[PDB]
Ligand binder design. Sequence first.
Ligand SMILES: Nc1ncnc2c1ncn2[C@@H]1O[C@H](COP(=O)(O)OP(=O)(O)OP(=O)(O)O)[C@@H](O)[C@H]1O
Ligand SMILES: [Mg+2]
Lengths: 459, 464, 592, 173, 55
Amino acid sequence: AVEQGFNVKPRLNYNTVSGVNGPLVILEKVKFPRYNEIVNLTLPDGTVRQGQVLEIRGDRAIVQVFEGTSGIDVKKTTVEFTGESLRIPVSEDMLGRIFDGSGRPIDNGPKVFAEDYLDINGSPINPYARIYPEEMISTGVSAIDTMNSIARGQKIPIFSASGLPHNEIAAQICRQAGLVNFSIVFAAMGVNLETARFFKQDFEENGSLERTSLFLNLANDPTIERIITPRLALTTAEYLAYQTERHVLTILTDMSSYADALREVSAAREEVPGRRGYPGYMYTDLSTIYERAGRVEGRNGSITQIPILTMPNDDITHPIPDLTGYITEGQIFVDRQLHNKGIYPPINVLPSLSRLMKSAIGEGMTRKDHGDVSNQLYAKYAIGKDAAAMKAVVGEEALSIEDKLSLEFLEKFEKTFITQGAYEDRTVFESLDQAWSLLRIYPKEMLNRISPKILDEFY
Amino acid sequence: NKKAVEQGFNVKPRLNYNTVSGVNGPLVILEKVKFPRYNEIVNLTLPDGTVRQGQVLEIRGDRAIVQVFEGTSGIDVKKTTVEFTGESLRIPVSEDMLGRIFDGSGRPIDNGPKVFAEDYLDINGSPINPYARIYPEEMISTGVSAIDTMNSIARGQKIPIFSASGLPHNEIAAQICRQAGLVRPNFSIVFAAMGVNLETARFFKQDFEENGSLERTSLFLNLANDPTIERIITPRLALTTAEYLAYQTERHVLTILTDMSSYADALREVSAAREEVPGRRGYPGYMYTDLSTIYERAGRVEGRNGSITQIPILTMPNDDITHPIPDLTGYITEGQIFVDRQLHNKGIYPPINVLPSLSRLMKSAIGEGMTRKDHGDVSNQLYAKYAIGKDAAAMKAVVGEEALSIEDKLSLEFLEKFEKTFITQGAYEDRTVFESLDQAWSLLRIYPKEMLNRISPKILDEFY
Amino acid sequence: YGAIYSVSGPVVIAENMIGCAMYELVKVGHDNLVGEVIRIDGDKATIQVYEETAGLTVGDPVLRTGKPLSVELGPGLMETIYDGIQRPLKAIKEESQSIYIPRGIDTPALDRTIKWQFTPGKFQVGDHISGGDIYGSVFENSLISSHKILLPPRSRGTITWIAPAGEYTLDEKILEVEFDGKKSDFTLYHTWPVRVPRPVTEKLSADYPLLTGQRVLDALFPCVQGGTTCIPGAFGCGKTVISQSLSKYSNSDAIIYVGCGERGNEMAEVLMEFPELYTEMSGTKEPIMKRTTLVANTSNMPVAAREASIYTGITLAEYFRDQGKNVSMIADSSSRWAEALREISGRLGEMPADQGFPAYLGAKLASFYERAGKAVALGSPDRTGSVSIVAAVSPAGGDFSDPVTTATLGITQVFWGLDKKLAQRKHFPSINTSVSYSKYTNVLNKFYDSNYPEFPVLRDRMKEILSNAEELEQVVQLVGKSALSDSDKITLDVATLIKEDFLQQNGYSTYDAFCPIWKTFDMMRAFISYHDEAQKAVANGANWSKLADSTGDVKHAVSSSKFFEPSRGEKEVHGEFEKLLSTMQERFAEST
Amino acid sequence: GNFKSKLKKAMLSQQITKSTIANKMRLKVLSAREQSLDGIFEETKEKLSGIANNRDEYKPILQSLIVEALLKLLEPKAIVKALERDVDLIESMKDDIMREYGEKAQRAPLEEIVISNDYLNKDLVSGGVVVSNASDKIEINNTLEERLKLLSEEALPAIRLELYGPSKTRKFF
Amino acid sequence: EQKNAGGVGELEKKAEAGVQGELAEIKKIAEKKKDDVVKILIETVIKPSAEVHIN
Ligand SMILES: Nc1ncnc2c1ncn2[C@@H]1O[C@H](COP(=O)(O)OP(=O)(O)OP(=O)(O)O)[C@@H](O)[C@H]1O
Ligand SMILES: [Mg+2]
């Protein structure tokens, strides 16, 4: 029997505000302040803004206001301490709902009829209670389904840059991310109305609104709610996937914008900064967000995060992409050079990686040649890039027969294999057959990475 | 008549503060100050009797933070007395300043009397109302072919001179001063020296004396020996003098601000003395605003015939446009005259590289009524073909001269006869803009008529 | 009334101000300097004054107005110039009789003496009016006629009395609205906080192109009416000239030209030249100045006022959008707005983040760029407007890796990159065709198929020709051009022709000041047909050198097509172009 | 082929048309649940106002509603805002309030408790008190309306379990 | 195709009637358990706890 308790706890209305530095509101005479506690700042105008406590002294309680500090005074601002951390009202009815960055619905609908209140921060999932994700998601993208495979329970971001079709690639995966249906929890952190409308239209056309939940924190929305949005989306995803046994496909976008929100909060707190001013605990925060995805023992559900990370200057050495690639289980790399060449999806397969490909692309799950073909394609594409550099620097006639064959392989790999176009829906087996057609350019002697048995069977 | 005199007859006693809460770096902090202002100039009297002059920069409750212009060395807590003038720095300005030589802080180093001030004007000045500012559309025949055909200078333009350490920017800037004149019929030069060496200052003084301009110049010499903090106020003094002499005296003024790289180095030193932001390359984040406060004081205004033209002389550290000083200066100013080390080494005078050079007040003041009707098309074609010639020369160096085509060979010939005959010019030879245009038309006549795609066909038919 | 406690640069920590709100407008000093509160540390309240701080004494009174920085929307804005905090520079000059801007001038943001012809709308007494509904219109000028008077947003109720048709000043009552038994009196103007975007019913996906008038911008990297646009580039690249040309020759109904950190001489040039120019819109020749207002906050003006200038300009654009007009804001330097933000942040003491720019710079830029977009106005009658923000970023050192440039590229949809190599050698517009991109080419397919069906195909062909020629030039510059194929030589020659004639546009020449969309499409057709004819003739067997020698006349005719003045009209110019292709086809068949 | 491509675009519009109607009807059911829920709370407000009418039964109510709020303040002095109807009742029970606070809290009974002259709005507040600190800075809205709002906000899942039974979709917890 | 497309979008009465049963069921459940739920909410509000903070 489910045990839920009726209880009324009065809340103290602290009129004492002693600092509104930046996005942080500092109280003065709080009685027993509670760390990570939701407070309501009743503005003199009348509107209330949620807040979270980030640090407590003996009597002070620094509060970060999610909706911004614009309009906050000291004389007539009263802070009401709710006494508990943020608990989003979760329910199975959230599917089909569009929420704001703070969890308040914006779909012209009623407040969600709560089935339970779950802590936003969650808890670390027991490593002994986890299951290694082995079921391979057969995304329609050939550059992903082959050479960087996605499993149910993986956290595989999309490393992109400004102007690249990361939104289009993620929407394509969402449209066609079946096994070899997926509920979607889409979190928007500071993306523009163009991207939000594209995703909403993308879901409506494909019929995903029957089973999707959106947390749209647009660029017009306050920047501090970009901190709260991914936690809300991921606790909703955790609720669905585990307590409801659904297969959630969490799609975070602008994790770089989330990290910028952290930097804005960290800079206001005057904490000791890391690289590029980012908080020294940004690794821990990003890990807390990312590691909420995976399969769990006993439960028949899973979470498959695809956080759309846009590298600021297309540099993977930036702290945000570096820590994201160190935490997550791979990355999908979108190349500005390939986009300039006109290749869609412009997935640069070399920097891209899928750590679960080794277990998800074996025999039985897919064809017996998946790993060998992927390794051979990787080796020949690297040789092609080296041969292109050699042709650019040294004369073309100096290139060997192998170099010319590898240049041809690069041309047909980028212009026929990677180039897919939207709505194409290449099955894993069809993509493997096309990859073999690519590899049939070389004589069987040159194919070193292919094992002899597979080479005899499939060549 | 003039009612500003009556305010002069008012004695105002000034407090003499013996309280110094402490001195650190070039900043001296005062305590128990009675109602401090924010830029009031104060006179620190050291124990040795020498009187430094400083101005407050931050004023908390009953506390003031003064930076002294002549450095804080020798300041003692017990004996220094600070006198609060109660007003920001105010240079005494009079029309008799024309012909005098002052110091970095405005003190007359001309061995003459103190200037019989006609009005005290704040050195910081005030921004000119954009509605009250006229667009300068009157060309200046600087004599130099490069600066008169390709980088024509308007009456109120603030086009600087970009050069490296050893380049003859002073020689070019002196040529402009002695040859500055309208294309369609004298300028009162105001010279400011910021950290220049004694040889450069003496050269400028002797050149002005030789050309006779010294009767219309008010030099503000602040040599390298002078304190490094008053390089900040020296251009402010020069521009206040120019603003007076133009907008209240109806004189067309040239303002020469030499070693603006040294001025910006002094600015960076002042910024790093405090805990200010480092911007790029260590220069303060407000360096754009300070350089704007300097440069934007030029231009013509509505209802007043006076005009100020600024020819700041910079010193690029590595001859790089990407350096913060030249970058911000070209962002603020209305062009630049780029002096080329490559051309100087090749042997060309003036060694002006026209490709990095730019004149934003050329669009106006170049036309069919101010200059010849072919001026803009000729200049555009000259830039196009000179850049094509430079690219062809690079390709010649890379793949030999034989691989070049007919167009590339013509470009090489045009570049040779352009750098050798057009850009090259005697130090004391001035060329009328029409003669320079005729030479440019000869250089274009090197090319066939078909390849001139930047010349409007009517102009091409009429002038070829 | 508080007191001043600390003055350090453009920030003034004023004590004894318990009760001051965040971003609440104050009056620091005896001259009533305009300032906004940033931090509130107890009774202290740090203020960023929007004027010159020189002369502020410790103890000067600081008044608390009670309302945020509020622009004054209403009739009379259209043909004016503002000081960043919406102070009419003409009124300041007339009141002061000085070429300077005095500290603390409190001139009304809109002229109050001018009487405006008022025409009441469809609403009458008793009709329930909502926020943003149009209850009348005023004749502002010949071009912007019927300057529709909007009920202020968040103001609602039943109309008790409406002013009849006649002549009214701004201070005169125009409407009385009863809400919950409390009457509210409404005038011709109404204030709005610049920080908060003006509400709209629902934003729409922009689909109509913003005809810049520049060939490369209009063809290769188009921008729609209602989309953010970025123009990075070092000094002398052409950002200001591109912005001014867009304001002069755009298809937008109104222009909000905002200059933050720009020279005063650019403002003087605009004020001098815009009345001279005329537009063919509204069925008559009216000066450009009649539909463009200028927010002038130059570089020597107070640092803190650049943000106020940006916000005032964007709010004016939002007002004329809510009027249902197609407006396009032109921020002259978002980089200079960011440098003002950096100066304020450094004076305050916040953490420098990247390069010294404050950590909230990205969020502020994102919000400002999100203000733009095509939208349906808030209230009935239904009308649709758009704000196109085309802001020129100014990277430090001429490198597109600056934090401001990176944030702007992340947030905007159109990126018109400028290369200083082409900025020199007089190749304006100095657009870098390799790095520049426009994400509205997909949505603009509807307009292109409706009007010029071959426009996207021709643009794609020209883009691929430019890319092939870039690769060919890269390989040739190191390995010479002694091994190129005939097709490679054709590509190189045609792309050099495109760069020299089509892509480059002399905005200050009569023929190339404004190349309209039809002329640009016809010239793209001419160049692409030239390239195709050359390729076909050479593939037939003709040597490229002999073909060029024989078709130099056709090449000259194609390259001189820019000289066709668009003032002749679409019919005349297209008639000459049709003969150009026919002659070129004949001169490629006879030669072959 | 052209006709087939045109039909595909029209078909994709049919899915959006069906989805929009499906979502609109789906939110109609959800809005019906909230409207039905609002009847639960509106009926509760009527009885909460009804209980305040019963003078005898409201005497122990205001005993707890004041001492419970004072024990959270833990302040030796307090200011009680209450309806003008309850002022006499509070003045009568003040000694009991002091004794109960001193008994429940380990500290001595509060030195002075004073009823604020400014009374709660009759229409909004139907019962209870809003105690405050000695300086009228830290206040606790312990009115019956505020208590019911807090309960309706933080007791929704149990109301769901009572009304609509358990969740069929849910399998864990 | 256009004729078939028009008929698809007109279909809304069936969807409206489909939910009409759900509204009736919700109203019935509310009318059934209003007494119990309101009474327990009243018990919770009326019966507070005089609990001092643990610290
Ligand atoms: N489209 C154009 N047609 C003709 N000449 C042009 C064009 N664009 C720029 N120019 C020339 O190049 C100059 C570049 O000046 P401009 O005002 O465009 O610089 P900017 O890049 O905006 O600089 P800043 O960053 O300092 O504001 C113009 O003054 C003009 O002489
Ligand atoms: Mg500019």
